[PDB]
Paper text:
Botulinum neurotoxins are the causative agents of botulism, a lethal paralytic disease, but are also one of the most commonly used therapeutics for the treatment of numerous neuromuscular conditions.
Mutation of Y1117 to valine produced a 10-fold increase in affinity (KD) for the GD1a polysaccharide in solution and a 2.5-fold improvement of EC50 when measuring binding to immobilised gangliosides which is in good agreement with the 3.5-fold increase in synaptosomal binding. Mutant Y1117V, while causing the loss of the Y1117V-Neu5Ac5 bond, provides additional hydrogen interactions between the hydroxyl group of Y1267 and Neu5Ac5, not seen in the wild-type toxin. Furthermore, the Y1117V mutant also presents more extensive bonds to Neu5Ac5 by interacting with the main chain of G1279 (N), and making water-mediated interactions with V1117 (O) and the side chain of D1118. Mutation of the bulky aromatic side chain allows the sialic acid to occupy the new hydrophobic space offered by a smaller residue. In addition, it also causes the repositioning of residues 1277–1279 within hydrophobic range of Neu5Ac5. More surprisingly, mutation Y1117V led to conformational changes in loop 1270–1279 upon ligand binding, with residues 1276–1279 providing additional hydrophobic interaction.
Numbering used by the authors: 872 to 1227, 1231 to 1270, 1275 to 1297
């Protein structure tokens, strides 16, 4: 059983951002809106008057009620707040308020906020708060799924990545008369360099339930394409820093290249900070990995689930090949960084797998017959957490050391590489 209650379903199709709902509400795109070159559903809004999108709702669907239930969902990527200018500065990003009644999404330092206000200025807020004083954040500068539901008899709820975060009572609000238009735009933000990314805005004419929200979250994640740490499509030929999810305070290094050497995790990462604003683990540490095309016949640059690839490791501005001799005794096969011309018959083919919580990747090493050597993780040998391929992993959650994320340099993180 399924029920459609769509009032606005904003999507890039053909060659245009349009409303796919039967209403086909009219859209105006300002001249300073950016779109991602590969996924044109990703919309970037700057702190500029012309970086905006306005939706004019059909009259039959404007919200003007005491009892009508409604929900919204959208994905958002919010760059790290860098300066004290952001500290006590709530700014609207999605506005459907007219004359101090309606609804809006706003942001503040470490916050996503939903506000409802009735025509007698009775107001309620539901708030998601996330810290910037944290080693590794699930939320800072990463694609987040937002869902907000409204039941006029009881509660408004905000969900993040399909999980309930905050619920507050709204049964005391009366007539909420929202705007005829929805304005996507940074409104009242003092940080001149602030922006957001947004995608897949929806409005629904019901209170969505927990199952509907989960299904919506799973579907829109696009599990067929692997993601980087930030939640963008993972790509071939792109240098990435590595994060192991069970040892997040460690980074990948190599001692020596060639079959006598090995790679290993070491830490701590050390810190990036601006006093009273953020304090996080440094992300741009260790040897970079580059994903290389092997078996995929697709001619775009995206790494798909189950793609069979090679992995290059960058040491001193030179590319080596991640590889192992699977014959070595023990289920754990230690990985080395080989000269590319000299890899010979060593195992190097990696099956890339997306795992669906944040943006998880697995890497299943295979020999040249296509037989499994195993998922790449790590193993303690003496004092040293060496990288290995091990079928022990394949034969077993966030317990295991075989989950990884790939971190490219991104403007919304602000860290400067050490070199």
């Amino acid at each position: 059983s399924h029920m459609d209650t769509s009032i606005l379903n904003l999507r890039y199709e053909s060659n245009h951002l349009i409303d796919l709902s039967r209403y086909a509400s009219k859209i105006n795109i300002g001249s300073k809106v950016n779109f991602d070159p590969i996924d044109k559903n990703q919309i970037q809004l700057f702190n500029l008057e012309s970086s905006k999108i306005e939706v004019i709702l059909k009259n039959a669907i404007v919200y003007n009620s005491m009892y009508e239930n409604f929900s919204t969902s959208f994905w958002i990527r919010i760059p790290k707040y860098f300066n004290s200018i952001s500290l006590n500065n709530e700014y609207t990003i999605i506005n459907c308020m007219e004359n101090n009644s309606g609804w809006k999404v706003s942001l503040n330092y470490g916050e996503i906020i939903w506000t409802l206000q009735d025509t007698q200025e009775i107001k309620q807020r539901v708030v998601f708060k996330y810290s910037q004083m944290i080693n590794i954040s699930d939320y800072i500068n990463r694609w987040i799924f937002v869902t907000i539901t409204n039941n006029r008899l009881n509660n408004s709820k905000i969900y993040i990545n399909g999980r309930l975060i905050d619920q507050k009572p709204i049964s005391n609000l009366g007539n909420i008369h929202a705007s005829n238009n929805i304005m996507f735009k940074l409104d009242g933000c003092r940080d001149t360099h602030r922006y957001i990314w947004i995608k897949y805005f929806n409005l629904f004419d019901k209170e969505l339930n927990e199952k509907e929200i989960k299904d919506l979250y799973d579907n829109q994640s696009n599990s067929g394409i692997l993601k980087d740490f930030w939640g963008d499509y993972l790509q071939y030929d792109k240098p990435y820093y590595m994060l192991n999810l069970v040892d997040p305070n460690k980074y990948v290094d190599v001692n020596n290249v060639g079959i006598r050497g090995y790679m290993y995790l070491k830490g701590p990462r050390g810190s990036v900070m601006t006093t009273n604003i953020y304090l996080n683990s440094s992300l741009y540490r260790g040897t970079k990995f580059i994903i290389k095309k092997y078996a995929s016949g697709n001619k775009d640059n995206i790494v798909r689930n189950n793609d069979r690839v090679y992995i290059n490791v960058v040491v001193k501005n030179k590319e080596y090949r991640l590889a192992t001799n699977a014959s070595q005794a023990g289920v754990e096969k230690i990985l080395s960084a080989l000269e590319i011309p000299d890899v010979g018959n060593l195992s190097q083919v990696v099956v890339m797998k997306s795992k669906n919580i944040t943006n998880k990747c697995k890497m299943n090493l295979q020999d040249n017959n296509g037989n499994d050597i195993g998922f790449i993780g790590f193993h303690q040998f003496n004092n040293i957490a060496k990288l290995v391929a091990s079928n022990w992993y394949n034969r077993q959650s966030r317990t295991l050391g075989c989950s990884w994320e790939f971190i490219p340099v991104d403007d919304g993180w602000g860290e400067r590489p050490l070199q």
